[PDB]
Ligand binder design. Structure first.
Ligand code: SG8
Ligand code: SG8
Lengths: 447, 447
């Protein structure tokens, strides 16, 4: 009764749209057994390398677990817990005959619109594992971006430790995936794909991937991206202003030597004007210690008021540098040394950026870019599945009488997604690739 | 060609499932013109009273807008901005001929699976207005629960003002509804209901309401409910312990008078044992000032160490109260006055709960309970729409040859939902129903 790619089945749930007794064969008709075997090689490679190196990093954190429950380590721990669980789920298709168990129905058709009764749990389990670890992973990524952003604002005793926020971090990171997963199962939109060897949301009805895949991931790129940009906004404000205020102090010092060793009134004059231009450039800046303060505060007032006195004292020294009162101008500029000390020296204070915090910023922008690729690949599949579906409907009709599949999913896009998803797990596992861990695995080698 | 409830239409998008040339009539076939007219009376009543009283509260906040952008007022302002915009959307069906424009198609069938081309914007606009204000409203509700929870932890100089968090509050409250709304429009699941007179997500395909209605609202009840419970956990910890530590000081004082005015050694003995039991009961408590501290800190140590000295001094006074050394026991218990002063008097410190913060807790638990009803009503419709749908399919088949609609949506449940949704807007608008606003509308009456 049925012709390729349809298959004989007496289950009304397995039957194809309009057609009776026939349902779509389990092995993805849009891809050849060679394309499948190749894809399964890609998944096993990236999955295996992610799985054990995330396990290594997860083992490193559990070794030093007293010192690992200390921010931002505890974040990278959970980020790893998620990519490790996601790798397990993806690596389930490799167990002897497990892929057919996950992606196929009893009657040999594709496992679609799961959960269903009379069909097994193997599909929904691998979906929950992969999807729940994914959404928990991208929400732990948001936590990471927040922590990294929080490192800059807490540059003093404005200190509200992340140690207390831990209760809200574990609220969001486990309630959000739970609610989204429960919703997917309630509407039974877990579907199997043999090239993926995994069960996932809205494979078949691509419209369920908007709300459950593109909308959560889209949101984490918004909230995550906000905290990554606001942080580098502070990193570059601090690093540039300290460098600006330093270079203005240095030219001020340079000219004070040019004045001290001046053999004429013309040199003192141009050296004081250069000092005045450097004093205004320094006034038109925020000292790193006054970054978390308002651009009109009584503290920020003292900074810019000191440069008013310095410009004022420069202007008094310029009233003597125009004529032959060089000795009276150099002695005036010598009292400029004491003003520069009482109103600039204080603002050359380092405000040294912690190595752990700067490193967290490296990981945040790497986890971002990877999730950005995931979102792009998933988005691509969303906007083109209607086409792949109608090009498939035609293949079954053509073969219900030279038959081809005109449009089809891109396998480089699927491999680019899996790279940018597994590569993240490998990237976030390189957080423990430090000297301290080499010694952590040496202090446990004996003990 | 078509029989009731189907209607003649040549648009393939308007046609019913399997049937050609026939599509389902716009006026909701499951409800009578009387049931409709009644429902439109309910919506106009609750909508009109919410709409103008939210507008009043929105006008009160914009009057004192300098002092209104101060937490938690700024929250209630946006909560109101949302119920006011949602009321506008709900009240659009009352404009002369607008309901048919919103809920009907050109051909007279129900407006379903919108956005579509060749059909008008009237549907999707009213959906965005109602849905975006809803999701923004329940996320502003979460912000409210967080603010109220934050009032208790910041009981000193641990002060991290909400004034700084405002940037993250406006991140979440406008990015989350935007992403969810964009997703609904991308999968075209805006549907019209004539009894509602509004366009909304997944009216027809009830499965799209899980992810876009039950999952966001479900989440806000989780995150919102967490901050409401953790706050009352602190309100009741503080109010009970201060009362516990007060009542233990009072019985200690009571017995010190019973000792001072004792005419025998037997009275001094039972009065000191009662003082010792009250001293341990007081030791087995957390002073409100030491609530945000760890139950083993060097400060919490001093508290419980003072009661060790007091019990120690009571035990020394009990060594004299057993025999006829009454005068030597009363004088020993008189030096107990000084110990009680140096180790208990400090912990009777008020730690007075701000009236604004306690009031915010009243509104948080009211907005919660209302959203809890909304979630229950929406959940009810989700689990029963498959039934109402199959009972409808039968009505069209029966009428394609005594015909009735066996199962149908509950109109008290729809009226209970609309009450618990409009009533919230009216409840959250009663935040400005204070003396200060009566004077705010008096200081603007002239000026
Ligand atoms: C997120 N990354 C994705 C990208 C796209 C991938 N994907 C989606 C999918 C999987 C399983 C079943 C159906 C499906 C569709 C329509 N009716 C029944 C089943 C659709 C596919 O490769 C396939 S299989 C397949 C099919 F059998 C019929 C029609 C299709 F158009 C089609 C497509 Cl598209 C999987 C991996
Ligand atoms: C959240 N609060 C809700 C509760 C339920 C409400 N609701 C859902 C709805 C609205 C509009 C179209 C369809 C719809 C369904 C199936 N095919 C085509 C259209 C379904 C209904 O009252 C109706 S109308 C209606 C119908 F015309 C056909 C079959 C139905 F079963 C049914 C139901 Cl159920 C609206 C308000």
């Amino acid at each position: 009764q049925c012709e390729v790619p349809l298959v004989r089945t007496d289950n009304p749930k397995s039957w194809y749209e309009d057609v009776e007794g026939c349902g779509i064969q389990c092995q993805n008709p849009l891809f050849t057994e060679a394309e499948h075997q190749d894809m399964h090689s890609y998944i096993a490679a990236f999955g295996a390398v992610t799985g054990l190196c995330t396990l290594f990093t997860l083992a490193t954190f559990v070794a030093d677990w007293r010192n690992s429950n200390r921010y931002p380590a505890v974040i990278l721990f959970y980020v790893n817990a998620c990519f490790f669980v996601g790798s397990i789920g993806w690596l389930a298709q490799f167990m002897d005959g497990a892929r057919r168990e996950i992606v196929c129905r009893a009657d040999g058709t594709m496992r679609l619109g799961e959960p269903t009764s009379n069909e097994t749990l193997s599909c929904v389990i691998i979906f929950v594992i992969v999807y729940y670890a994914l959404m928990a992973g991208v929400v732990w990524f948001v936590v990471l971006t927040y922590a990294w952003h929080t490192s800059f604002k807490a540059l003093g005793t404005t200190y509200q430790p992340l140690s207390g926020k831990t209760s809200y971090f574990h609220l969001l990171t486990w309630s959000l995936p739970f609610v989204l997963t429960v919703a997917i199962l309630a509407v039974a939109q877990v579907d199997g794909d043999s090239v993926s060897g995994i069960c996932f949301v809205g494979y078949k009805n691509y419209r369920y991937r908007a709300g459950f895949v593109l909308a959560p991931i889209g949101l984490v790129l918004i909230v995550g991206g906000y905290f990554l940009i606001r942080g580098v906004m502070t990193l570059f404000s601090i690093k540039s202003n300290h460098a600006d205020l330093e270079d203005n102090w240095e030219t001020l010092n340079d000219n004070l030597k040019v004045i001290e060793k001046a053999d004429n009134a013309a040199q003192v004059k141009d050296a004081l004007t250069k000092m005045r231009a450097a004093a205004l450039d320094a006034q038109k800046a925020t000292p790193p210690k006054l970054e978390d303060k308002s651009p009109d505060s009584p503290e920020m007032k003292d900074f810019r008021h000191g440069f008013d006195i310095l410009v004022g004292q420069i202007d008094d020294a310029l009233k003597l540098a125009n004529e032959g009162k060089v000795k009276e101008a150099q002695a005036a500029a010598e009292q400029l040394k004491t003003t520069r000390n009482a109103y600039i020296q204080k603002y050359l204070a380092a405000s040294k950026i912690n190595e752990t915090m700067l490193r967290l910023g490296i990981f945040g922008f790497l986890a971002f870019g990877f999730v950005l690729i995931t979102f792009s690949c998933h988005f691509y599949d969303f906007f083109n599945q209607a086409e792949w579906e109608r090009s498939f409907r035609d293949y079954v009709l053509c073969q219900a009488n030279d038959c081809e599949i005109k449009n089809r999913p891109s396998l480089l896009v699927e491999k680019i997604n899996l790279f940018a998803m597994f590569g993240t797990g490998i990237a976030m596992s390189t957080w423990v690739w430090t000297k301290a861990t080499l010694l952590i695995w040496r202090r446990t080698w004996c003990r």
